[PDB]
C-alpha cells in the first residue's frame, strides 16, 4: 500500500455516514486514486474537542482509507477534504507498511571512552 488516509468525521447516524464515506471515496477515484481497503475504527470520544467549520466537536467517527495515488495528485485531495463541512479532520500519510523493518540487532554496548585527556603526572 502507498498512501493512508486518516479521516475523523462528524459523529452521525448510519445514512449520512455511508454518504460521506462514498462521496469521499469517489473524490479519491476522481483524482485517479485506486483504493485497496476501507477501515472503520469505531466512533469514539476524541482526545480533545476539535474546532472545524463553525463547530466544536466532541465525538467523532474514525476511518482509514488505503490507496495508490500519483505524486502530483495528493495536494488536490487535501483541498477537497478541506472545504468539506462534515470532515472533522483530514490527514494523508505515507502508508506504514511500505516502510522497512531492518532488524534491531540488539544493543551494541558502548564501553567507556579513553584517550581524551593526556597523560600528566599532576598533583
Amino acid at each position: 500500500p502507498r498512501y493512508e488516509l486518516a479521516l475523523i468525521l462528524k459523529a452521525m447516524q448510519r445514512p449520512e455516514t455511508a454518504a460521506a464515506l462514498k462521496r469521499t471515496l469517489e473524490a479519491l477515484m476522481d483524482r485517479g486514486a485506486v483504493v485497496r481497503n476501507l477501515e472503520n475504527l469505531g466512533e469514539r470520544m476524541l482526545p480533545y474537542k476539535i474546532s472545524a467549520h463553525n463547530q466544536r466537536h466532541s465525538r467523532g467517527g474514525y476511518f482509514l482509507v488505503d490507496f495508490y495515488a500519483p505524486a502530483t495528485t495528493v495536494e488536490s485531495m487535501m483541498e477537497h477534504l478541506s472545504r468539506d463541512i462534515d470532515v472533522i479532520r483530514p490527514n494523508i500519510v505515507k502508508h506504514p507498511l511500505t516502510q522497512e523493518v531492518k532488524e534491531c540487532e540488539g544493543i551494541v554496548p558502548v564501553p567507556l571512552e579513553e584517550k581524551l585527556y593526556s597523560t600528566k603526572k599532576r598533583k
Binding site: 448510519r14 455511508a18 464515506l21 462514498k22 485506486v34 483504493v35 485497496r36 476501507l38 477501515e39 469505531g42
Partner: protein, 59 residues
C-alpha cells in the same frame, strides 16, 4: 544476481495480481462502505516487558 532480481520482481508482480481482485471499484462502493460500517477493526496494541504481545482482551 540477474536470477535474484527476476525472481523478486516476479514474486511482487504476482502479489499485486493477487490483490488486484481485492480492490474497491465503482461497484464495490455500496457493498464495501456498508461492510466496513458493520465491522470495526481494532489497531489497539500493547506490550509486556518480556517482549510478549497482548492484544485487546477478548470480547
Amino acid at each position: 544476481e540477474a536470477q535474484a532480481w527476476a525472481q523478486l520482481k516476479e514474486q511482487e508482480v504476482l502479489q499485486l495480481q493477487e490483490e488486484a481482485k481485492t480492490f474497491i471499484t465503482r461497484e464495490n462502493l455500496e457493498a464495501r462502505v456498508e461492510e466496513a460500517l458493520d465491522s470495526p477493526k481494532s489497531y489497539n496494541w500493547a506490550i509486556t516487558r518480556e517482549g510478549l504481545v497482548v492484544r485487546p482482551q477478548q470480547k
